Ligand binder design. Structure first.
Ligand SMILES: [Ca+2]
Ligand SMILES: [Ca+2]
Ligand code: NA
Ligand code: NA
Ligand code: NA
Ligand code: NA
Ligand code: NA
Length: 603
């Protein structure tokens, strides 16, 4: 079990003491100079931003409050009278203008502007919204979607430039995200089932039975392309309209589920829940014999990159490498490539070269899984030769080669491959460790990448059907646990089985908030942050913000993000200091997670 103890809590204020309920996910960013060095950066203690409301008035706006990561004390003076934001959606934060200080982006149905606050809670910029009222209120995500160095704001009624304001309008969407769907370097915008180019041009639209709420991007199959996970919560009286679905980059359905035994669901977390990322990796575990002549040559290992090997060859096999720039062998021959994932056998011809009278590899003939043959070199180069076949074992793939090439007393343009050896390994599904988890009206359900349900854990959310989840590796074994919330309890669930590993009393009427793990101090021992409200008789335990830490000093919560800057958090769109990258590498090819706090190194 995971043992916890309270780090601090916030439940009251001298500024509007009646506004003390919270029902939107917390945000974590640096807002003050804790160490007194005149700067605000990752050396300080990250802070919490929430929106508070009074009683049951969560639909009528609330106050943005900044809470110190150290002790929960309020960092702001509210000398401006406070800033109203919608209390149902978390704001978003980042250093938008590059001055080293965090800005906070939010809006409400009561203002015609997107309000951008400085780190002290005072208005800094305003952008006139496309829509008014409830149609202009939803999630906000921050990204540089066209790579021009300026940050775009993805809001409920359109996409905005921090500098120039509204770029294009769209119908109300509770959720928007950006990702490069087609590999052209530009990020498209996905909102309420519609994929737009970043100028607003329509690309495609997933036809659903009700509003499409939050989405995740991840790699859930065997290619380098992104997949999209989407939730349609519908309502408890129209459960036939709810679903969870995985879409391909072109909008086609990979799989979808309508589950009448657990309808609803507005948001998911996607992460390494079913195993460690390494448990899905294909590694070398066997090899062929050595074919050819090893005298006066040093064995050098060549592993295939992107399941490809490069080969230069003419009359004979001259050089082999992972790519054309890092090749073992002589300088001659023309260039070809081999798709190693398709190779099922290789015939190697080695012997005395009739042109030079040297001994080496004269030809290799690859048999592919479709029966086609790819050859390099030529058997006709032999004065004498031997031909041998190596079969790739069933269930294994060709992963690389050991290559011998003699240099002594040879011109570089006459050096060649003198011996070869094939390296193979057992094949495994590239995403067998990945899971998709979400909460419905009745339970938290975990799915594998193919749409098979792995487990279901009863979780009372009859009042909403949209409650959120997040992910974090509390135990430190490389596999994320699931963080869940219902009317009365926050719980930690085992990723592989759903077993309950921790329970914390924490009440909420529930909307779509989730708990957050973040390493506030940066010393590799994280904090667990959750919001609470007690206005409803069926969820009357506590109210405010409650922050926990590991109760066992020999069990620190390691490798947690220093920052959780928006509701659609997935690392790749934020740096630790709060700046936003101009061209971030694709999340689905690095940590391949969404709404996980766990810092992961790719591959
Ligand atoms: Ca400082
Ligand atoms: Ca701080
Ligand atoms: Na800034
Ligand atoms: Na931009
Ligand atoms: Na694109
Ligand atoms: Na993919
Ligand atoms: Na774990």
């Amino acid at each position: 079990d995971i043992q916890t103890k309270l780090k601090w809590s916030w439940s009251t204020s001298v500024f509007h003491p009646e506004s003390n309920q919270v029902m939107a996910a917390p945000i974590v960013v640096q807002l003050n100079d804790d160490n007194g060095d005149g700067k605000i950066d990752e050396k300080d203690v990250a802070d919490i931003i929430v929106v508070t409301f009074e009683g049951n008035k969560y639909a009528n706006g609330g106050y943005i409050r900044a809470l110190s990561g150290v002790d929960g004390s309020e960092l702001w003076s509210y000398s401006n009278g406070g800033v109203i934001a919608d209390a149902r959606y978390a704001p978003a934060a980042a250093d938008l203008d590059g001055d080293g200080l965090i800005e906070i982006v939010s809006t409400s149905a009561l203002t015609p502007y997107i309000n951008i606050l400085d780190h002290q809670g005072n208005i800094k910029k305003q952008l006139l919204k496309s829509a008014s009222g409830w149609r202009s209120v939803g999630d906000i995500a921050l990204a540089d979607i066209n790579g021009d160095g300026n940050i775009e704001i993805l809001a409920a009624d359109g996409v905005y430039s921090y500098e120039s304001g509204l770029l294009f309008s769209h119908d109300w969407a509770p959720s928007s995200i950006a990702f490069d769907s087609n590999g052209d370097g530009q990020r498209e915008v996905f909102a309420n089932g519609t994929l737009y180019q970043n100028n607003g041009a329509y690309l495609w639209q997933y036809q659903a039975n009700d509003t499409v709420w939050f989405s995740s991007v991840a790699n859930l199959d065997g290619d380098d392309k992104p997949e999209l996970v989407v939730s349609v919560p519908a309502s408890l009286s129209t459960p036939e309209n709810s679903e969870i679905a995985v879409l391909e980059h072109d909008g086609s359905v990979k799989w979808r589920v309508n589950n009448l035994s657990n309808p609803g669901g507005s948001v998911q977390a996607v992460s390494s829940f079913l195993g460690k990322p390494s448990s899905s990796a294909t590694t070398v575990d066997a090899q062929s014999a050595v074919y050819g002549y090893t005298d006066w040559a040093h064995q050098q290992r060549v592993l295939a990159e992107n399941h490809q090997l490069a080969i230069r060859s003419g009359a004979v096999v001259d050089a082999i490498g992972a790519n054309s720039q890092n090749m073992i062998g002589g300088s001659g021959g023309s260039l070809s490539t081999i798709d190693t994932s398709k190779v099922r056998a290789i015939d190697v011809t080695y012997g005395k070269n009739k042109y030079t009278w040297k001994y080496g590899v004269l030809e290799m003939s690859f048999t592919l899984d479709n029966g086609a043959k790819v050859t390099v070199g030529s058997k006709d180069s032999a004065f004498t030769s031997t031909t041998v076949r190596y079969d790739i074992p069933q269930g294994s793939q060709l992963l690389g080669m050991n290559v011998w090439s003699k240099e002594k007393h040879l011109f570089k343009h006459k050096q060649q491959v003198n011996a070869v050896q094939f390296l193979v390994g057992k094949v495994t599904a590239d995403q067998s460790h990945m899971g998709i988890v979400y909460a419905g009206y009745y339970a938290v359900d975990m799915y594998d990448a193919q749409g098979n349900k792995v487990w279901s854990v009863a979780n009372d959310d009859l009042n909403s059907g949209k409650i959120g989840v997040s992910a974090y590796d509390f135990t430190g074994d490389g596999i994320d646990e699931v963080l869940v919330q219902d009317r009365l309890r926050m719980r930690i669930l085992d990723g592989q089985t759903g077993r309950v590993m921790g329970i914390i009393a924490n009440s909420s009427g529930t909307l779509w908030e989730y708990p957050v793990v973040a390493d506030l101090e940066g010393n590799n021992n994280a904090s667990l942050i959750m919001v609470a409200n007690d206005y409803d008789r069926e969820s009357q335990v506590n109210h405010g913000v409650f922050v926990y830490e590991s109760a066992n000093p020999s069990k620190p919560w390691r490798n947690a993000t220093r920052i959780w800057n928006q509701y659609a958090f997935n690392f790749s769109d934020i740096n630790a200091n709060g700046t936003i990258p101009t061209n971030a590498q694709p999340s689905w090819l690095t940590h391949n997670s969404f709404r996980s706090a766990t810092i992961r190194v790719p591959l």
